[PDB]
Amino acid sequence: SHMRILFATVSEKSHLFTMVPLAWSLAAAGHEVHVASNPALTASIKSTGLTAVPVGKDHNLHEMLTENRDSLENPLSDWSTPELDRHSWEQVLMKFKVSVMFAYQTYNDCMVHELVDYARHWQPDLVIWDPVTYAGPVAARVVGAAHARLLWCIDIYAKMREVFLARLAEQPEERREDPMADWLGGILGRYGHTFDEEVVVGQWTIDQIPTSLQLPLSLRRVPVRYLPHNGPSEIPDWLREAPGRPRVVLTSGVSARAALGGTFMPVADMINTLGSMDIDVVAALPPEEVEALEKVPANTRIVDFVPLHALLPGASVLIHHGGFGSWGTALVNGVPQFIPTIRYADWWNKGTSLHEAGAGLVVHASELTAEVLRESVERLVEDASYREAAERLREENQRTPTPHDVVPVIEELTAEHGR
Amino acid sequence: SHMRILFATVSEKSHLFTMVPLAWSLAAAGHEVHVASNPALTASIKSTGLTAVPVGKDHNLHEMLTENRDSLENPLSDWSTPELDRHSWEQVLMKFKVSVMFAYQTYNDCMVHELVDYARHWQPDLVIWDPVTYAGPVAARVVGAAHARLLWCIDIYAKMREVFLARLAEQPEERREDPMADWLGGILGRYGHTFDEEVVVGQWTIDQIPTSLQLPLSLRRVPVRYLPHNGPSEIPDWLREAPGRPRVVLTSGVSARAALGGTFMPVADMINTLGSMDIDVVAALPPEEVEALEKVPANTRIVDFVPLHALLPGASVLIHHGGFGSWGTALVNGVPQFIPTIRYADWWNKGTSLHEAGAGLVVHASELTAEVLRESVERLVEDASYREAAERLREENQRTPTPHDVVPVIEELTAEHGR
C-alpha cells in the first residue's frame, strides 16, 4: 500500500539519470516519489518527469574540475582494486580520510541538514540513495525510514568498506579510527541518533550491475535490470538510414573531459584516426571540442548529443570513458565497448570487467595512441568473439527482474526495515 | 515479452501529461516507449523523461485560440449530452462533420503521413493514442499494430459515436454517409488498408475515469488509476507552513484563458471576491493576468505555476475549468471542486459528474458572479457532505488497478490484437 519515497542524489546529472527508471516504476505503482538534490540539479530533475526537491546550497565542485585541465586519477582515490592484498591498515584508513574529506563532505554537507529537515516534514517511508549520497541514509535514519542504495557502480565503495572493517578489527583498541563513523555519526549525534553500518551501505542494495560483473559482498542485494535513461531525448531524422558498414560511436562529455584532463590523446586525433577507416562514425562532442576540429572526415557525423538508446541498436562499437549510462546502454544493446579511461570512480572496473569477459577492451588513457585505437576498433568489429560475449551479457541483463518486477520486493523490504 | 510502444498525441501539453504515468509504467517493465507529436510538443515531451519523436509540421491552432478573446462554446461542438433523444440523424451527422473538419483534421492531418511513416520504420507492436489523436490508429492499422485509446475524458467521443451509428442504421442506403469513414478511410485507402470502427474508438480503451463517473459503452475497457502528472514540478519552500484556515486554490491557464474568452467574470474580480473571505488563497495565473491585477489581497498568494499534486493535500477547495490534470489531482486528494466552465470538450461533464455525486459544484461560466463564487466556496468548505463525497471518489480511484498492475493486461491484449 501507498508509500512516500524520497530519492536522494549528489548534483550529478549522470548519477541522477541512472535512478530515473526505478523512480518511475515506483511512481507507476501509485507511490509518491520526490527527488532531492542541490539547487543546481533542479532543472535536470524537472526534465525526468519527476518532482524535484531543492535542498541545501550548491557546492563549488563542478566549477572546480572543469577549470582543471588535469587528471583526477590519484593513488588515494584509486579504488579500482579493493583487496586486502593491496591495502595495509594505514592505506585503507587514508583512502577513507581523503574520500570523506575531499569528496563525500563537499557533495553532502551542503545539503544534509536541509535534507534531514525535508524528511522530517514529508515523513518518507523509504529513502533510495545514490551510493555516494550519504546525506540520504542520515535523513532516513533520523525519521526511522527504510533506506537502500541504488547502484550505478561496480561496488568498489562497499568492497573497500569490507577491506576497511577487516583491517580495523586487526588494530589495537587505542588506534581504532573510522572517518565515516566520525563524520556521519557526528551529524547523526546532533539529532540524538547513533551511527550504524547500514548508514554506509544501506539496509539493502538495489543493484543495476549484472551479477556476473559485480564484486561479491555481504549485502542484502536486490538485482534489477538496467533500463537505458540517457537524459532528454529526441529521435533525429537521420537515424532511419541503416549504415551499409559498421557504425562506430564515440562519446566525450563535459564530465569525461574534466576528469581525463588535457594530457592524453586529443579527441581531434581520435576523430582523424577513425576518419581513415571503413566505418560510419557518429561522435557526440561538447561545443568547445567541436571547434578544436580542423576538418570533419567524410565518414563522420558530429553531434552535440544523440540518445544512445536509439543510436546503439545495430551499432558495432562504442568508445567511452566508462560512465554507466554509456556502459549500460551499450550492454543492453550487445555492442562491444572500447574504454580508454582512468582509475576514477569505477571507470577502470567498467572497462576491465568487459575486457575480462571478452566483451570489450580497456586501455589506460595515457597509453592511447592512433594505432592502439585503430587496432582495438578493428578487433571489436572483426573478431566475432567480442559481439558473442557482449550478446551473453545482454542476455544476463534481460534475465534480470525489471524495476516493475522488483516493486513488490522493495515494498516488503520497507515494511520489514521501516519504523 | 519485449515490446515497442508508440504513444501518439495532438500537440497539447495538457493531453500529453495525462499519458505520462502509463507510458512510464510500460517503460519500467522493460518495453521501449517513444512519444510522437508535432514539433511544437517536442520540448514538453522531453521534460517528461520520455523519448520524443517529432512528426509532420505544426498547426496554427493554439496560435489561433489565444488571440481569440472569444468563447469556444458552440451548439455544434457541444457534446456534453450525447443522447439519442437530443440528436436526430442530421444533428449527429452535422456534429461529426464540423468536428472532423474544424478539429480532428487540423490536429492530425499535419502529422498523420509522417506518423504512418515512422511506424513503418519502427514497427511498434502497440500504439496508445490520446482520444482525438486519430492519426494514431491509422498508423497502427497500416503496420498491423494493436492500438488502444487512453482516456483523460468522460467518454463523450465514443458515446456520440454510438448515437451516430444508431442513427446511421435508421437511414436508407442512398443517404448513408460517415465523415470519420471518408476522412480516415481516405487516408487508410491511400495505403491499401480499409476503414474499420476500431480506428475510431480503438481495439480497447484504457480509461483513467473512475467507473462510477464514466458513460457505460460497448467497449473493451481496461480501468486504470489516475496518477497525477502536472508537468515539470518542484516543491517550493513556502509549502511547509500549514495554513491555519481552509486553503482555496484557483487555477487559470493559457488554455483555460483561450477557451472561456473575455465575456465572463474577470479573474481579477474572482481574486477580489476570495480576498474578502477567511481563507488562504493560492492562485496560479498566466503572466498577462498577473499585471491586470491592481492589488493582491492579504490572504492571497499569486504564482506562475505550482504543482497541484503537492499543493492539494489538505486543501479545502479547487476552482478550475474542468481540465483533467486539475480534476484528477483534486480527486485523488479528496478536495471538493468548484467548476465554472463551458460545454467544451468534456469540461461540463467533469463538473456535472462531481455535482451529481455531491462532491463538488458546477456552474456555467456565464452565470458566475461574486455572490455565486462566495457562496459555492463557503458551501464546499462548511458543508461536510462535499468532502465526504469527494473522499468516496478518492477511495474509488485508490481501489482501481495502477498502471503497474495493468501492464500484463496491456501485454496480452497486444498479443491478441493485430500481429
Ligand SMILES: Cc1cn([C@H]2C[C@H](O)[C@@H](COP(=O)(O)OP(=O)(O)O)O2)c(=O)[nH]c1=O
Ligand atoms: C554525450 C552523450 C551522452 N549520453 C548519455 C549517456 C548517459 O546516460 C548520460 C551521461 O553519462 P556519461 O556516460 O557518464 O557521460 P557525460 O560525460 O555526457 O555526462 O548521457 C547520450 O545518450 N548521448 C550522448 O551523445
Ligand SMILES: Cc1cn([C@H]2C[C@H](O)[C@@H](COP(=O)(O)OP(=O)(O)O)O2)c(=O)[nH]c1=O
Ligand atoms: C496552472 C497550473 C497547472 N497545473 C497542472 C494541472 C494539469 O496537470 C496541467 C494542465 O492544467 P489545465 O487545467 O489542463 O490547463 P492548461 O490547458 O492551461 O495547461 O497543469 C498545476 O499543477 N499547477 C498550476 O499552477
Ligand SMILES: [Cl-]
Ligand atoms: Cl489575512
